C-alpha cells in the first residue's frame, strides 16, 4: 500500500547525493567541473565585494582543487543555529550570507547552496582561514565535520577552499584544463584588478596568470584575436541604474559567426536570459533604425544576422539576482530586460553617429550576411 | 561581516527568497511550472497506473484545480507528527519518488514539486479521497489551516487547488494554449491517460439557436490511443508528409525504456520532442544525444551501402533536417538539470538509446527501401544546401 510510511524527508545533504542533477546539473564533466565554479565563483564574490585581489586555483595531483583569496574568509566564530559558521555554510542548504545586499553587495551566489553541494559530492573538503586574526583549519570527511582547529594568530586574511569530488557520484573525476582556464579568464576580464592564477599540478606545470586592466575591452580583444575585426574601434559603454549595472563591450569580426558570451555578477549565464535578450532587443532596433536612416533590402534585419560575425560581451552586476537553477544558465529579472534594453538602445545609437567609419562596415556587414539567407531561402 | 551575517533559510522561506532556483523564472515559464509541478503529479499515479484520469481547471479568479482519480496523498499522520499531506505539501526533499517502491517510473525525484507551490502560492486548497473518508486541508500563505475528515468514499484521488502568489509573479494570467499543448503532449507519452482541461475565464468549446444554447465553457479533452504515433501525426499535422509509414519502435533494459516516433517532413526545421518519464526535456539530454548519433551512424551507413553519397560528410544536423521525431524514455532513476528538469543527464541512457535506436532504425530502413531512399535523398538535398552556404 502506498500512504504515510511511503513519504520520505532527506536531510539537508542527502537530497544533495541522491539528486546531485539538481544543484550541479549533471554527474558527467559539466557537473564535475561545477564544483570548482561554485568554490572560485564563492571567492569572486569577495573580490565583487572589494576584500579580495587576488584569487589562486590549483588543479592538485591527487584529485583535489585548491582555491585561495586574500578577502575576508569563512565566518568562523560561533553561529546562532550552535554549530560555527563555517559548518552551517559547508554543510546546510539555504545557509549564505547572500540572502541580502549587507555582506556581499553585488554577487554571483545568492542560493546559499554551492559549497555545501560541494561538501556532499566530495569524499574530503579541507578548509584554510585567516580571520578574527587566527589561522583556522577544518575537515570534512564524507561531507561530515572532523572539528574546527586554531592555529597561529596571523595579520593577512581570507579563505582556501580544497575538495576531493567523489567518484562514487561523478563518472570522471578527472578535470579539463583548458576548461577551467577559459572559465577562470572569463572572471578576470569581468572582474578589473583580480588576479586569477591557475597551476595544474598533474602528471613540467601547467600555469596561467589572469588580470586584465583593461577589462570587457580586453576581452573583445581576445575573442577578435584569432578572427579578424572588421573594425578598429571596440564598443565599450556602461550604464548604471537601481539595483542594477551594466556593461557592454563588443566589436564585429570578419567572419560568419556568433560570439556573444552574456555574464551576470562575473557567473556564466550561457543560456542568455532577460539581459542577452534586452542587448538583443536594441542591437536589432538600433543597427535597423541606422541602416533604414541611412540606405534598399525591403524586409527587417534578423538579430541572428545582424550577430553573424559579432563579438559580444554583456555583463550585468544586478543587486537581488533571478537565476536559472543552481546551475545558474539564465537570468530571468524582467526588470533587467528593459534596463539593458534602454542602455544598450541610447549608447548603441551614440556610437553608431560618432564612428561612422565602422558603422558603415557593420551595417552592410548585417544587409550582405541578411541577402545571403533569402538567397539561401530560395533553395 | 560574520555569523550575524549568515542566516539559514527554513525550506519555504527559501523558495520565497530564491523562486528562480526552483521555477526558472517568476515570468510566464514559472508560473507555468506551478501547474506542471501539480500535473506530473498527477501523471506518476497515471504512470504507477492507478489514476486514469487527470482534469485540469483554469478558474475565474485565476486559481487551479487539479483533480486525478489516484491514490490520493497520504492523509494519516507521518513519522514527523504531523499529516503526510503537511510534510509533502510544506516540505522540500519530502516525497514518495526517492526509491522505486511507490512509483515504479515518475516525473517526480527531488521531492519539491508541490511543496513549491505551496510556497508561492497565496493559498492552496487539498482534497484527497482516500482510506474510506474526503480529507479537505487549506494552506494559508504556505501554513495549513486544519486537516478535515468528511464524507465517507469507496472513491480515491487528490485535487490540487492553487492560487500563484501576485507577489511572486510578474504576470498571473496562465495560457490555456500552454497549457494545453503541455496537457496534450502527456496524452500522447501515457497510452490509457485522459486529459480533461477546461478554462471557466473563457467561454468557447443560426444565430439565434446559439443564444438559446447552454453556455459551454473553454474545454479540450486529451486521450492518444496512438501514443507516440498520434504525437508524430501532430507535429506534422501542419507539414507535408515526405514518407507515409510512421516510424515507431520500443526498447526495454536493465533499467530503462525507450520509444521512438519518427516522420520526416518537407520542412527545414527539425521538431525533435524529448521526454524522460512525461517531463518534457526540452534541453535536450543523453537519451537525445544518444538517438542524435545513432541515427547519424545508420543513416551514412545506409547511404554508404547502397551508394547514396559512396561522397562529403553527412552531420545529424542535416539528417534530422525536416525530422519530426518524439522520444519518450522511462527511467527507473533519472537525472535532470534542476527542479525545472530541463535536460536528462543519465549517461547509461545515452549508450542504451543509441544501440535500441542503431538496430530499429535499420531494421526500419531495409524494411521499407521505398520510404528509407526518400530520407536519405531529402538528407542529400538538405547537405548541398549546407554546402550552398559555402
Ligand atoms: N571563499 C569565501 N570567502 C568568504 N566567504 C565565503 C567564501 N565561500 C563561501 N562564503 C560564504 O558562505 C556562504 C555560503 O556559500 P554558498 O554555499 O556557495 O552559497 P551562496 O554563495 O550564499 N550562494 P550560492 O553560490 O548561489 O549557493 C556565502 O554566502 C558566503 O557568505
Ligand atoms: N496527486 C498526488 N497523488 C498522490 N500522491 C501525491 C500527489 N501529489 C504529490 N504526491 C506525493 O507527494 C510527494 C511530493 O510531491 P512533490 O513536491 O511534487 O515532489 P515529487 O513528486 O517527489 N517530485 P519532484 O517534482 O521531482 O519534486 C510525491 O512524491 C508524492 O508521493
Ligand atoms: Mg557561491
Ligand atoms: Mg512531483
New binding site residues.
Partial sequence: EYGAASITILEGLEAVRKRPGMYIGSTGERGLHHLIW??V???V??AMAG??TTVNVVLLEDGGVE?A?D?????VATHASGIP?VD???TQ?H?????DSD??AI????????????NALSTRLEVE?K?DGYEWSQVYEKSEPLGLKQGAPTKKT????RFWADPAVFETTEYDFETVARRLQEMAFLNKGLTINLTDERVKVKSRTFHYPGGLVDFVKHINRTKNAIHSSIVDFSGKGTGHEVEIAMQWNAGYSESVHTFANTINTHEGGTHEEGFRSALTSVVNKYAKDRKDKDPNLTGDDIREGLAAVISVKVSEPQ?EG?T?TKLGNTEVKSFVQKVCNEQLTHWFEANPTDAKVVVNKAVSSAQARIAARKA
Avoid at 578577502?71 to 565566518?75: E, L, N, Q, V
Avoid at 545557509?95 to 540572502?99: I, L, Q, Y
Wanted: charged letters at 20%; a negative charge.
Fill in positions: 561554485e568554490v565563483d564563492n571567492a564574490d569577495e576584500y579580495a582555491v583569496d578577502g575576508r574568509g569563512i565566518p559558521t552551517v555554510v559547508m542548504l545557509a549564505g550570507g547572500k540572502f555582506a556581499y554577487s554571483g551566489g545568492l542560493h546559499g547552496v554551492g559549497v555545501s553541494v560541494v582561514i580571520r581570507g579563505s582556501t577552499v537565476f543552481q545558474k
